[PDB]
Design a protein around this ligand. Structure first.
Ligand SMILES: *[C@@H]1O[C@H](CO)[C@@H](O[C@@H]2O[C@H](CO)[C@@H](O[C@@H]3O[C@H](CO[C@H]4O[C@H](CO)[C@@H](O)[C@H](O[C@H]5O[C@H](CO)[C@@H](O)[C@H](O)[C@@H]5O)[C@@H]4O)[C@@H](O)[C@H](O[C@H]4O[C@H](CO)[C@@H](O)[C@H](O)[C@@H]4O[C@H]4O[C@H](CO)[C@@H](O)[C@H](O)[C@@H]4O)[C@@H]3O)[C@H](O)[C@H]2NC(C)=O)[C@H](O)[C@H]1NC(C)=O
Ligand SMILES: *[C@@H]1O[C@H](CO)[C@@H](O[C@@H]2O[C@H](CO)[C@@H](O[C@@H]3O[C@H](CO[C@H]4O[C@H](CO)[C@@H](O)[C@H](O[C@H]5O[C@H](CO)[C@@H](O)[C@H](O)[C@@H]5O)[C@@H]4O)[C@@H](O)[C@H](O[C@H]4O[C@H](CO)[C@@H](O)[C@H](O)[C@@H]4O[C@H]4O[C@H](CO)[C@@H](O)[C@H](O)[C@@H]4O)[C@@H]3O)[C@H](O)[C@H]2NC(C)=O)[C@H](O)[C@H]1NC(C)=O
Ligand SMILES: *[C@@H]1O[C@H](CO)[C@@H](O[C@@H]2O[C@H](CO)[C@@H](O[C@@H]3O[C@H](CO[C@H]4O[C@H](CO)[C@@H](O)[C@H](O[C@H]5O[C@H](CO)[C@@H](O)[C@H](O)[C@@H]5O)[C@@H]4O)[C@@H](O)[C@H](O[C@H]4O[C@H](CO)[C@@H](O)[C@H](O)[C@@H]4O[C@H]4O[C@H](CO)[C@@H](O)[C@H](O)[C@@H]4O)[C@@H]3O)[C@H](O)[C@H]2NC(C)=O)[C@H](O)[C@H]1NC(C)=O
Ligand SMILES: *[C@@H]1O[C@H](CO)[C@@H](O[C@@H]2O[C@H](CO)[C@@H](O[C@@H]3O[C@H](CO)[C@@H](O)[C@H](O)[C@@H]3O)[C@H](O)[C@H]2NC(C)=O)[C@H](O)[C@H]1NC(C)=O
Ligand SMILES: *[C@@H]1O[C@H](CO)[C@@H](O[C@@H]2O[C@H](CO)[C@@H](O)[C@H](O)[C@H]2NC(C)=O)[C@H](O)[C@H]1NC(C)=O
Ligand SMILES: *[C@@H]1O[C@H](CO)[C@@H](O[C@@H]2O[C@H](CO)[C@@H](O)[C@H](O)[C@H]2NC(C)=O)[C@H](O)[C@H]1NC(C)=O
Ligand SMILES: *[C@@H]1O[C@H](CO)[C@@H](O[C@@H]2O[C@H](CO)[C@@H](O)[C@H](O)[C@H]2NC(C)=O)[C@H](O)[C@H]1NC(C)=O
Ligand SMILES: *[C@@H]1O[C@H](CO)[C@@H](O[C@@H]2O[C@H](CO)[C@@H](O)[C@H](O)[C@H]2NC(C)=O)[C@H](O)[C@H]1NC(C)=O
Ligand SMILES: *[C@@H]1O[C@H](CO)[C@@H](O[C@@H]2O[C@H](CO)[C@@H](O)[C@H](O)[C@H]2NC(C)=O)[C@H](O)[C@H]1NC(C)=O
Ligand SMILES: *[C@@H]1O[C@H](CO)[C@@H](O[C@@H]2O[C@H](CO)[C@@H](O)[C@H](O)[C@H]2NC(C)=O)[C@H](O)[C@H]1NC(C)=O
Ligand SMILES: *[C@@H]1O[C@H](CO)[C@@H](O)[C@H](O)[C@H]1NC(C)=O
Ligand SMILES: *[C@@H]1O[C@H](CO)[C@@H](O)[C@H](O)[C@H]1NC(C)=O
Ligand SMILES: *[C@@H]1O[C@H](CO)[C@@H](O)[C@H](O)[C@H]1NC(C)=O
Ligand SMILES: *[C@@H]1O[C@H](CO)[C@@H](O)[C@H](O)[C@H]1NC(C)=O
Ligand SMILES: *[C@@H]1O[C@H](CO)[C@@H](O)[C@H](O)[C@H]1NC(C)=O
Ligand SMILES: *[C@@H]1O[C@H](CO)[C@@H](O)[C@H](O)[C@H]1NC(C)=O
Ligand SMILES: [Ca+2]
Ligand SMILES: [Ca+2]
Ligand SMILES: [Ca+2]
Lengths: 123, 387, 107, 387, 387
């Protein structure tokens, strides 16, 4: 069975760093596009970042741009989010999701989602 | 022994029915491969059908969610034209992209498989793995999905690598007995080139491709099989053949450049030239892959601004599903005939009453005689077939 | 950008009539890169509609969607107790953007 | 007409994908033989796949508890490379051990069946039962489980008889048109020799075997096809290829003797030499048959104490099941190419959600061009397949 | 081009395993013909298996009550030796009795079908219906149920017509390219002759038949392929081969006449001669068709009262079911080899847990080398197979 498991969510004082780590089982990142998506407490799903199957970071949300770094290890099938200079607005539930780029039809849409990991900025 | 395609082109007034496989109808009872992206190619004796199978049959648990195109399990299946892809089908290489030639002596298969970043193209000739190439642009390496063309033992394969909407590196590979003897980078006015339908326009090869980035007209690649010189342009007819495309009244070509009209995606198709006129085929619906019609545009290969049609045929009806189509040439007694195949796609992402995606094929060939009307859909009823 | 305005901020209805959810587009976009998701609190998001007209694998037949250019709509033709949640419309072509949501509540 | 393998060895920088059968995925829907211990061999035209079938299909009541290796019902199945073992497969002899040659004129099959104490090897050439031999050590008579090699019509088969952990009598049989013309007892430094992967290193045959008694390095048997003189040694590279084996940080070899490291059991595998370097393949997991990688050890055929890899490839992933692998040589236009096959085992004794055991095959061939990355597992989902 | 069988007979010390079809085991999953009365015959290249199929598969509603032998639906099925009788099997004539030759140029099929009173024998050569004969005794016309023998283009077929327990007219038909050129009435000391296993004992044909009326020894018919002169006698060995038969200690033979011991019914079997000794095969159980053993009786072809076996083999275990067995000769490089086949019957009238009757085949060939022990039953478990 395919599954995505996020881990790394924790309290961070403002100005800190946390690394989130989404582990994938049942498929390879070498053929799927991977996404980080967040829901702020009280608000709606925001697309944080997107990485291609070919390894390039196509997008970073304007707020996260310059502070977050998204990467992947295709040997362990892991996705990483290095968050630096965390502000209180970045407290949220984080989600790793998966979609596809088809040669014929194109981008498909996020069909596999993780459990989620909570990142809370305190004081 | 070698094949040189030296004869003239046969007089074509239209196309006559040639073959039908009824794959989906037989899949309801019986074990039939789940395929897509088919084509046809002929050795000097008979004709063969090829497809990219998803490594499973249709009445199978593994048939669920087979809409993807790049999996480690897709292989290239080859039968004689007419024999459905039953469980005795020989699968001739690991490939999620493919192309195939016959140079008059042995079959050549170009098979692309592997990771999306680092992909491998194996060149198999006469049952040997003769050569191999890696991605140059470190992207989805892909090829014609139809037959390639050999002249005097030198076969030509068009391979694209790079972004689907942007500048991609397209190369033309000249292969001799499976060994790549030369490689020419694409040069000319065609910006995006994909999934080319090539035919031997002696003394060279002419390919009509798809523009998946900025045009609804089709690109043209003229390969000089001898000097290895490439020329690129666009199909000049005012009735463009890609889909999505604008309605007949509002369409336009440029004969050199993309038209910048509804050019976001496209479908693999074909076209060839009869003097100044162009024989072409496209889907009847301008936005979905529904139906399939072929016709002739008068002065369509030389004049943009021509929308005069004639000799129209309806191969598949307006409300019936079609897909990829392509051309292949057959050596006749005194001339070279042009045939085409249409892929009739059925299943998920457009019909949500099944969990699988598969295709059937319908094959027509040009004729100098007369012909009637008809419509040859797939015919499968998915409301009764197993999910 | 293409701010997507999901039109009904909260909808309350009874388990068994129709529910028309709307998604507005600031500027016209390719009508095949829009999707509809269901978020139930405590559960991960689940994809319902893809390409603005295609139901996903496993989604019941109740939900159907339609759209074109700036207008998009999803209807659960006959509601069910479980189908009460937040609904997002997403544009997964360039430029990437989500919606704010519509909350279906039993009334 | 005879085959003499006189050409040099092709320049090998790596291996490219060549074939995949998808047997287990097709077995979920359709009638496919239950097999194990496969291999590949080619006549001068095309290539064939062989397997030892358990006398039943997979969606069968007789598929239950097929983990045994010696039953009166196992036969040798032969198809063209690519065609899955459907019900039309020709089973060419009664055998629970087997090997196969093509001398350029006709196929040779060595087939072992019978009681563990008595055991008979039938030598079948050109569709005739030409010869037969009985067990010499009155134990489990067994052979290469891969292709044998013929040079000038004289084919060579390595057959072992005796204890798996102890001194066993290994012989090399020289066959001419199915008739055994000579038999040489093994002599040299290799103590236990089993399941050899042989290739024509003109003017002789070189076999890389498994040591199932006291070593995790592989034995080497050099057969002089002419003088019938046998030499034995061990693969000298510091990165040993048998499984179970010790970790790369602490593994050793002797280049003459068993290393006495994790040598209790083993797996059939291959290796060959490029000058002083050794091209080899092994499982990625050091203890279970999980994954499969091939690479090149620099000065590995000449020096124990060399652990320098290069040109590593991952044919099957770390978490995906593999099994027996072997080598076969293909005569090219100007040189001799080396290919290998990997057997992907699925089922009981390692996955207890099914009652059967079967295998699929994945085939790669050496290339002088470039290649990418990938992974080609079996792909079957046993949670959904019938038990 | 013609086949003349001129070479000597190969030195035979025993028989080695050659083939097994596993028909019943595969029938549990998959579509396999319901057959019975099989045999084997070889053209100068490879060997083929024939059977009389009941016009249905085993997992079929029509498989119920297929114990009859004469229905309008039985046809003659032919595959290569090894390929199971799947649904792609070519059925070569309408026949509930059959025999088959290959004269070195084309196949000859003798096929008997029709009413029990007025029956028709069609002679088919090279894919043409060349000749036809009617019953002479207006009874169940029947033939060898195994291969016939051709020498210099003249093939010979033994056909019986009349009462099973009484005087029946047996004839030997000499056929040339499908046309019956001569017909000799049987003459000699053999009273009842049925289901003959014939082999080319150059310069003639020697057939060992069954005595279904008054003997448990087997008849012998010596046909002079040239003078068309027939001689008849009985197998002279004291160990008789028919079943039912008396126990070894209390059995007898006459060399000329039926022994009048347990001669009521019988089973089709074989025997041939090595000098004065006789190589023979029979069922292990003396009353039921259970098991199958072959051995050599010393001075058994010339001396009755001889009960001195040697080189005994157990082809099918004593507790397992066997049936019809027969001989066929294979032209070797320097001599003529003798092989036999055993039919392993499974199903109704002896195992009442299924409603069908079918068979599997096991094939052995003579060898000048050594051999071991074993047992190769059918292996089907009928408690789990569909009824
Ligand atoms: C038995 O079978 C035969 C063969 O299958 C059929 O014959 C074929 O019939 C077709 C259809 O009539 C002929 O197709 C040609 O169509 C051209 C236009 O195509 C029309 O359909 C398309 C798609 O719907 C529209 O795009 C076209 O354009 C329309 O809209 C645009 C604007 O977007 C306008 O600008 C257009 O004017 C249209 O409004 C068309 O509707 C058509 O131009 C072409 O023209 C021929 O016929 C017209 C009159 O119909 C003549 O004036 C013209 O000069 C051409 O005349 C030749 O052909 C006719 C036979 O149709 C001969 O009688 C004349 O002598 C002359 O040779 C044509 O209509 C196709 O050419 C034709 N093929 C043959 C004959 O080989 C039979 O119909 C079929 N009969 C049945 C069903 O029993
Ligand atoms: C696109 O596809 C191509 C083709 O498939 C890929 O190219 C191949 O890449 C592989 C992997 O990098 C190359 O494999 C080689 O690995 C050798 C060591 O084996 C390693 O794996 C095993 C198993 O996991 C480990 O046990 C080893 O680890 C041990 O040693 C390392 C370091 O030594 C320690 O860190 C470990 O803890 C262990 O102790 C290894 O990780 C390796 O020796 C080999 O060597 C090259 O690189 C080293 C420098 O790192 C040089 O010293 C050496 O001379 C070689 O340098 C080459 O590369 C450069 C640049 O290409 C060339 O310019 C030189 O001419 C020379 O060729 C190597 O790393 C494999 O060689 C390579 N094949 C080819 C044909 O290129 C691409 O990776 C892939 N890219 C993608 C995914 O897009
Ligand atoms: C590995 O495989 C090989 C090949 O498969 C086996 O070798 C074969 O073994 C069988 C074993 O019996 C040999 O069969 C021959 O059987 C003859 C018949 O007797 C048997 O059948 C009758 C009917 O079943 C039974 O009743 C017998 O039992 C008794 O009853 C009879 C009378 O009813 C008595 O006569 C007997 O004494 C018993 O009371 C038996 O089952 C048998 O006559 C024949 O004779 C050999 O031995 C006698 C002495 O008894 C000699 O006089 C005679 O010349 C034969 O001796 C030769 O063969 C032996 C090998 O067995 C050599 O060592 C001698 O040098 C000499 O050459 C014999 O028993 C069959 O011949 C043999 N085939 C060969 C060797 O090719 C191995 O057994 C098997 N081994 C393993 C590990 O399982
Ligand atoms: C066809 O393919 C789809 C995609 O794999 C299958 O849908 C998925 O099915 C699995 C197994 O049923 C679902 O996992 C589930 O997890 C929950 C725990 O949250 C558990 O309660 C369920 O019993 C199940 O194990 C998975 O979520 C579901 N996913 C999607 C995308 O719908 C489907 O089962 C296959 N259908 C058929 C008919 O073969
Ligand atoms: C062909 O397509 C064009 C659009 O490219 C259609 O033209 C528009 O049609 C609508 C509805 O009639 C009008 O509201 C617009 O004013 C038209 N705009 C343009 C750009 O002309 C045209 O009507 C279509 N023609 C047919 C017959 O379908
Ligand atoms: C071409 O195909 C589209 C589907 O992409 C058709 O559009 C449908 O039209 C009917 C009304 O005619 C609507 O009820 C449907 O909602 C539309 N969409 C779908 C997805 O079914 C269109 O009519 C077809 N015809 C042409 C020539 O445009
Ligand atoms: C390689 O295997 C050796 C054992 O052959 C490992 O060495 C032992 O490792 C454990 C755990 O670290 C230690 O407690 C022992 O003291 C080590 N003993 C020896 C014999 O050295 C070694 O750690 C393994 N190396 C790797 C990198 O996995
Ligand atoms: C090689 O395979 C073995 C199985 O033989 C793996 O061992 C498993 O490791 C996980 C933890 O990593 C344990 O939870 C399991 O209990 C282990 N055993 C089994 C049978 O699953 C091992 O991790 C693999 N990897 C290597 C390189 O040793
Ligand atoms: C072989 O068969 C004969 C019968 O043909 C058996 O001889 C009879 O056996 C029974 C039981 O021992 C005696 O009651 C009879 O008196 C015997 N009659 C004759 C005709 O001798 C003989 O015992 C059988 N031998 C074996 C070893 O089974
Ligand atoms: C030969 O087969 C017969 C069956 O025809 C066997 O006879 C059976 O013997 C057992 C006891 O040994 C009885 O319980 C059965 O009732 C018998 N009949 C059947 C139909 O099973 C006989 O034992 C076999 N052996 C020989 C050599 O005669
Ligand atoms: C092409 O080949 C044919 C037959 O092989 C030959 O007759 C013809 O002259 C060739 N054409 C050219 C241009 O060489
Ligand atoms: C094809 O071959 C013929 C004969 O060799 C030659 O005359 C002609 O130039 C060739 N054309 C090519 C290379 O396309
Ligand atoms: C091997 O055979 C080829 C062709 O049969 C021949 O050209 C070559 O000389 C042979 N090699 C030797 C060493 O005899
Ligand atoms: C094979 O035969 C050829 C020709 O007789 C000979 O030259 C060559 O040495 C032979 N090779 C071997 C090693 O048998
Ligand atoms: C039988 O045929 C072979 C080859 O056809 C021939 O050599 C032999 O002499 C023939 N025998 C007789 C007796 O004519
Ligand atoms: C068979 O044919 C050969 C050649 O014609 C002849 O010598 C021989 O006598 C013939 N034998 C028979 C049995 O007819
Ligand atoms: Ca386009
Ligand atoms: Ca070992
Ligand atoms: Ca009798």
């Amino acid at each position: 069975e395919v599954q995505l498991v996020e881990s790394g969510g924790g309290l961070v004082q403002p100005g800190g760093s946390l690394r989130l780590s989404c582990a994938a089982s049942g498929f390879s990142f070498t053929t799927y596009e991977m996404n980080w998506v967040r829901q702020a407490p009280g608000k709606g799903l925001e697309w944080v970042s997107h990485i291609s199957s070919r390894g390039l970071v196509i997008y970073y949300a304007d707020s996260v741009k310059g502070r977050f770094t998204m990467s992947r290890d295709t040997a362990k099938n892991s996705l990483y989010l290095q968050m630096d200079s965390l502000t209180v607005a970045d407290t949220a539930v984080y989600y790793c999701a998966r979609h596809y780029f088809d040669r014929d039809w194109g981008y498909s849409g996020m069909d596999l989602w993780g459990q989620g990991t909570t990142v809370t900025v305190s004081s | 022994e070698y094949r040189n395609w030296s004869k003239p082109q046969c007089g074509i007034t239209g196309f006559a029915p040639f073959s039908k496989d009824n794959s989906i109808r037989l899949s309801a009872g019986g074990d039939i491969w789940v395929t897509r992206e088919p084509y046809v190619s002929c050795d000097p004796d008979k004709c063969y059908q090829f497809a990219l199978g998803q490594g499973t049959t249709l009445n199978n648990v593994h048939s669920n969610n087979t809409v993807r195109d790049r999996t480690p399990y897709r292989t290239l299946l080859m039968n004689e034209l007419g024999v459905p892809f039953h469980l005795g089908t020989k699968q001739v290489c690991i490939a999620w992209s493919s192309s195939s030639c016959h140079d008059g002596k042995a079959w050549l298969h170009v098979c692309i498989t592997g990771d999306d970043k680092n992909a491998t193209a194996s060149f198999i000739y006469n049952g040997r793995l003769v050569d191999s190439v890696v991605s140059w642009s470190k992207d989805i390496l892909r090829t014609q999905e139809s037959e390639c063309v050999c002249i005097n033992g030198t076969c030509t394969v068009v391979m694209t690598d790079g972004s689907a909407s942007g500048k991609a590196d397209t190369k033309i590979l000249f292969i001799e007995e499976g060994k790549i003897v030369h490689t020419s980078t694409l040069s000319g006015s065609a910006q995006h080139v994909e999934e080319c339908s090539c035919y031997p326009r002696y003394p060279g090869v002419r390919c009509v491709c798809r523009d998946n980035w900025k045009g609804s007209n089709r690109p043209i690649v003229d390969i000089n099989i001898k000097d290895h010189s490439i020329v690129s342009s666009y199909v000049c007819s005012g009735l463009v053949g890609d889909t999505p495309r604008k309605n007949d009244s509002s369409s336009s070509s440029h004969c050199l450049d993309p038209n910048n009209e509804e050019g976001g995606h496209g479908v693999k198709g074909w076209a060839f030239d009869d003097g100044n006129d162009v024989w072409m085929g496209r889907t009847i619906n301008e936005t979905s892959r529904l139906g399939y019609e072929t016709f002739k545009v008068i002065e369509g290969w030389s004049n943009p601004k021509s929308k005069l049609q004639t000799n129209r045929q309806v191969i598949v009806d307006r409300g019936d599903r079609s897909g990829y189509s392509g051309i292949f040439s057959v050596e006749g007694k005194s001339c070279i005939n042009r045939c085409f195949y249409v892929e009739l796609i059925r299943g998920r992402k457009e019909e949500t009453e099944v969990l699988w995606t598969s295709n059937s094929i319908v094959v027509f060939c040009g004729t100098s005689g007369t012909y009637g009307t008809g419509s040859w859909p797939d015919g499968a009823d998915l409301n009764l077939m197993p999910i | 950008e293409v701010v997507l305005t999901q039109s009904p901020g909260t909808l309350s209805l009874s388990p068994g009539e129709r529910a028309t959810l709307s998604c507005r587009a600031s500027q016209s976009l390719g009508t095949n890169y829009l999707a509809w998701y269901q978020h139930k609190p405590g559960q991960s998001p689940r994809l319902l509609i893809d390409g603005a007209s295609t139901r996903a694998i496993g989604i019941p037949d109740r939900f159907s969607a339609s759209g074109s250019g700036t207008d998009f709509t999803l209807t659960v033709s006959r509601l069910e107790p479980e189908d009460f949640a937040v609904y997002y419309c997403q544009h997964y072509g360039n430029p990437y953007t989500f919606g704010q949501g519509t909350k279906l509540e039993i009334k």
